[PDB]
UniProtKB/Swiss-Prot annotation, chain B:
GO terms for cellular component: cytosol. This is Thymidylate kinase. Its EC number is 2.7.4.9. HAMAP family: Thymidylate_kinase (MF_00165). It is an enzyme of class 2 (transferase). GO terms for biological process: dTDP biosynthetic process; dTTP biosynthetic process; dUDP biosynthetic process.
Amino acid sequence: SAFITFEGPEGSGKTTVINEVYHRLVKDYDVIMTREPGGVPTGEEIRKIVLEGNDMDIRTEAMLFAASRREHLVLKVIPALKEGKVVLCDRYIDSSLAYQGYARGIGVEEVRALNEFAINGLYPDLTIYLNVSAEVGRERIIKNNRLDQEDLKFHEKVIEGYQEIIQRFKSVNADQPLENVVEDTYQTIIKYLEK
Amino acid sequence: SAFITFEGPEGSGKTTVINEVYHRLVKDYDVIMTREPGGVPTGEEIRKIVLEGNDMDIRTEAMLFAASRREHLVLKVIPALKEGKVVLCDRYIDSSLAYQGYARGIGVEEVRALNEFAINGLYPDLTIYLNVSAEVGRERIIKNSNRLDQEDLKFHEKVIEGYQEIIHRFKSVNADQPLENVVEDTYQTIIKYLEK
Ligand SMILES: Cc1cn([C@H]2C[C@H](O)[C@@H](COP(=O)(O)O)O2)c(=O)[nH]c1=O
Ligand SMILES: Cc1cn([C@H]2C[C@H](O)[C@@H](COP(=O)(O)O)O2)c(=O)[nH]c1=O
Ligand SMILES: Cc1cn([C@H]2C[C@H](O)[C@@H](COP(=O)(O)O)O2)c(=O)[nH]c1=O
Ligand SMILES: [Cl-]
Ligand SMILES: [Cl-]
Ligand SMILES: [Cl-]
Ligand SMILES: [Cl-]
Ligand SMILES: [Cl-]
């Protein structure tokens, strides 16, 4: 089996990339794709508390998402890995680190500690990082008007966080057209699976 | 202000003690007594998921206790302390350490890290540990319920073992005494702290 996660800042083309790569991999491997909380009832119920929050404390939000993450891991991801499947996951611990730990300023070490408690040693075997520049990412988001200056700065912080976070990681140049980003990611995964 | 928590295994007389101490302190202090989630809506919703759980993973449970703990802390305890009140809290971080960490086996250090994230440095000013022996505790449990099965007896013993390690801020009160004495000792311990 293999636990592969996909990471990247806003405008990295990640959604398009993971779905196209998944569709291509299903043809040659016993693989599934999921995105937290992956439809896991308890995971959705915990997440609902955050979605209905009003000025909810950011640490409370982080712990609830961490709890939801573990439900998804123990009820969906782990059983699938035990069945010998390759599991592709759209975002995981690195997203929490880059967004909550770095960008939101909770603290990298604090959020890392929270992440570790939630995953209990289950790290990705491979993590694809869709490395997009702030400028291209911005345009892609706009492509999909203009963006607020506050958002632009947060966008930059998220990217800065991923840079610091990044053997587990394999970066793909996400500044290229999506077609190429897909091909590069697919090839990176095949190389890993065939090693 | 003063943030005073109460800790102890089952059968330690904790409910009776906090209530009686509260009624004595309120004459002279601007005090409140609370428990997590303590009426805080989000804390209530979080706690509800744990109660309705079916063989819930212990780490998920720990994180929910921690999330509820923070909502109660930020939305109820801190505002009270800011008003300069004495806050009596029935269970706090040490309960997670003893139950989730030690007794359930997640690990005290791991659960401590999780809870330090949750309380962000806000530790109790004073923590009353109602030190009851496994045997006296058992009898009180049977009362408030006969006989207890081995599984529950062992768990109770393990929780006590965990607390012993944790307290090895803390003020121990001998909870093997009649409740009247446990209450008096606890009250005197608190007054000594409040007047210093
Ligand atoms: C704060 C937080 C948000 N999220 C998600 C849910 C939201 O769709 C998105 C943006 O949330 P935010 O506006 O609170 O930063 O990120 C997590 O997955 N984990 C977290 O800890
Ligand atoms: C999974 C995850 C997402 N997020 C955020 C960042 C993304 O903007 C959003 C999900 O967007 P996405 O569906 O395009 O990946 O939620 C966090 O802040 N923390 C997390 O742990
Ligand atoms: C506050 C807290 C309580 N508990 C449990 C242990 C107790 O049996 C129960 C509360 O019971 P009590 O109201 O009689 O003290 O909840 C935990 O396991 N972890 C915690 O962090
Ligand atoms: Cl790159
Ligand atoms: Cl394109
Ligand atoms: Cl209450
Ligand atoms: Cl004692
Ligand atoms: Cl008595």
